[PDB]
Design a binder for this molecule. Sequence first.
Ligand SMILES: Nc1nc2c(ncn2[C@@H]2O[C@H](COP(=O)(O)OP(=O)(O)NP(=O)(O)O)[C@@H](O)[C@H]2O)c(=O)[nH]1
Ligand SMILES: Cc1cc2nc(N3CCNCC3)n(Cc3ccc(F)c(Cl)c3)c2cc1C
Ligand SMILES: [Mg+2]
Lengths: 468, 167, 166
Amino acid sequence: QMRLPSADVYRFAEPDSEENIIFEEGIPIIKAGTVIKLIERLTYHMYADPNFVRTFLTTYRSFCKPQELLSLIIERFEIPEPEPTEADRIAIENGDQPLSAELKRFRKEYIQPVQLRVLNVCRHWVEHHFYDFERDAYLLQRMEEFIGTVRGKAMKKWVESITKIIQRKKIANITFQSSPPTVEWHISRPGHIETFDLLTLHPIEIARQLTLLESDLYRAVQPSELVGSVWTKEDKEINSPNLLKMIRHTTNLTLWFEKCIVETENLEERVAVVSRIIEILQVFQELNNFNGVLEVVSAMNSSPVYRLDHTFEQIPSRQKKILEEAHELSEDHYKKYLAKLRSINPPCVPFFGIYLTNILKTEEGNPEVLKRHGKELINFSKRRKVAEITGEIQQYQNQPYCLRVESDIKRFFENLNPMGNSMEKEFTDYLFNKSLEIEPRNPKPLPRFPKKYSYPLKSPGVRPSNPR
Amino acid sequence: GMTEYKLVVVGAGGVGKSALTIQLIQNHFVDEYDPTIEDSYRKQVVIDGETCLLDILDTAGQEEYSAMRDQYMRTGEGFLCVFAINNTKSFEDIHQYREQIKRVKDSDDVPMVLVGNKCDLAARTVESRQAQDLARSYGIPYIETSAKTRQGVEDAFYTLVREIRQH
Amino acid sequence: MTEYKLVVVGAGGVGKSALTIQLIQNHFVDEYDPTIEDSYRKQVVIDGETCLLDILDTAGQEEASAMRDQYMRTGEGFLCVFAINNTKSFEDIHQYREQIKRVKDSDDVPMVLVGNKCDLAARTVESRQAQDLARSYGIPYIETSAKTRQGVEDAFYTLVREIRQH
Ligand SMILES: Nc1nc2c(ncn2[C@@H]2O[C@H](COP(=O)(O)OP(=O)(O)NP(=O)(O)O)[C@@H](O)[C@H]2O)c(=O)[nH]1
Ligand SMILES: Cc1cc2nc(N3CCNCC3)n(Cc3ccc(F)c(Cl)c3)c2cc1C
Ligand SMILES: [Mg+2]
């Protein structure tokens, strides 16, 4: 086994012990450790662990500042070479070239792997966690300086590469190649944005364009918006703007559905509205847009809508079944949803809410440190659990939908604003009062209301068409 | 077999709400939690001699999904309305949560408890007298809990189960 | 869902990373940024069964040649990639095949031979030559383009099938 530098000149050569590292019960899994040990294992000479690199880079800010991390990995990089051995000494004393076997082995099996793995940490840091550098320009200067002054031809290719990657990142296309289906139109025709509405757009195309929108919003959320539970804290608008944009879209669409329903006072017309929404739900299911599915289900379980007995009575049985199956996804703490998400063929749009709750509870329910033998060790298993969740999120963010954007329909749903200028409670009370108006509580008699739509209510259905 | 109670935790985000259920379902003999596993929100308990099963829904972290609140609340037969004693706004939110629960359950008499949660050492801003008066005005119990020591946690959940049983 | 550990190996610049990113993101990487070691995951339904693919994207640069044992031990299946416009990369294939066999101490390791960059006209390795090699290994040969997506799914999912039947 290779001898190491003295732990006095090189801190990362301390022997493992339960005072500085604890392993979980073919590479070891770390339960806890000092920062020094975490970084040693992050850049271990015996093996790579690219998943450890992602986990560490995603979660380290809870136990180490970015500036300090950079200092520590630079320290890790600077490994002292051993002195010539007795055999080397003898060779030199006789004017011969030493074999330097121990030196050569140490270079090949310790220094070069550790240094490359340090560079791999830098590369991942810059490529996938560049926000540290966006938020701290001096940090970036330090990284550029470190990388730009690494000498030696063994590291040269990656040094030159990482230098270019950083420069690209500072100033910062899909193949399918099967074509997306034809955009479908109903009563509203292309370019006639003024007529766009729930019943006038094609229900297929409503579901497609909302899915593209919701997929884009889902794909835009970075782990930086999630770690430390920052979307729940006072600075959430600063730290989690993409997550909040995504959630506010979902909320707005649910409210829009409720509004469309209760502002349609005529029972027959309202039935057509609900049927159309369940058809959109069906296309959401076909597209694996689970955010969309729950958007609809949440609307149907809302107080204003849920109580509409007369409307429910007239929904066709086959649509009741569709709505019921969608609802059952959320039953028993999303048991069937979780199973379904793990079984489908992506692309999909997950429901983000479950991830948020699991990240928050993991963070609040586990200690930052473990106390062992008088020492405080970083509880890394807690961080690994968080990174498992962010990792799953990222896995579903890779696959793009093969659907064509319709710019006007996209804009229509981007600009949807059912609450108008009203505050939430005001709007919420309004919807419930509308509900009470259109279907009064027993024993008040059911009134009649005039029709509001001048166009046909008959749905074109949700099976796609294909002319030549 | 044994009765199962569907309990729902509601209240403002960002102020330690989740500690209540975590501390219950945990064991406070090991500081540990995996919310990912089923039985992280199910717990068999004995209350006044009668064994029952508690199913707790705590959607902490999903507060911004405000249009899902009805759907989540609809699933429950008893409610813990949680505020943080160092956050007056969360206390002022309680009224609307109670109104929303009443509407969703279509009843003026829904089993619920008011819970004042102490989530850190920041200064208290809601005095217990204020919270007691509010709870009395609603005709419901008030329990204060610590997010750190597990104090009051069993009392909060058991009291709610008693409200359900005596409904 | 079963989890599968795939490893992509071969000489520097043959398009290992481009192939992997095309599979994962449907995107073609034009830049040549030499890999040290990257990891990707992909949930995908193959032959009607949902799979979780763990894909290890490895270093082809010779300066990293001393660091291969560690990932070869963990991999269940290997994509052995050369570029059809680079004869040396084809000659490098046999070295990877032999090391993998060595490390895993087996003559029966799931593998697929991949001839990448098949979008380019200036071919220097003939299909027949590569096919002969694959037959000698007892494995399939698939020509691919990370640029056009030609054969990319076929290469990775064929490897999954080999692991599945192993
Ligand atoms: N025309 C064409 N170019 C390709 C193809 N695949 C990769 N390339 C190009 O070839 C270069 C090398 O690609 P890369 O994926 O980085 O190769 P690699 O095998 O991962 N290299 P390394 O071993 O150093 O990590 C890039 O410029 C890339 O755009 C392909 O199928 N067709
Ligand atoms: C799975 C599921 C079952 C539902 N059963 C009903 N009700 C039936 C009669 N009594 C009132 C409630 N609602 C509320 C409702 C209201 C007006 C509708 F058109 C429809 Cl379609 C539904 C349900 C919502 C869902 C998600
Ligand atoms: Mg590469």
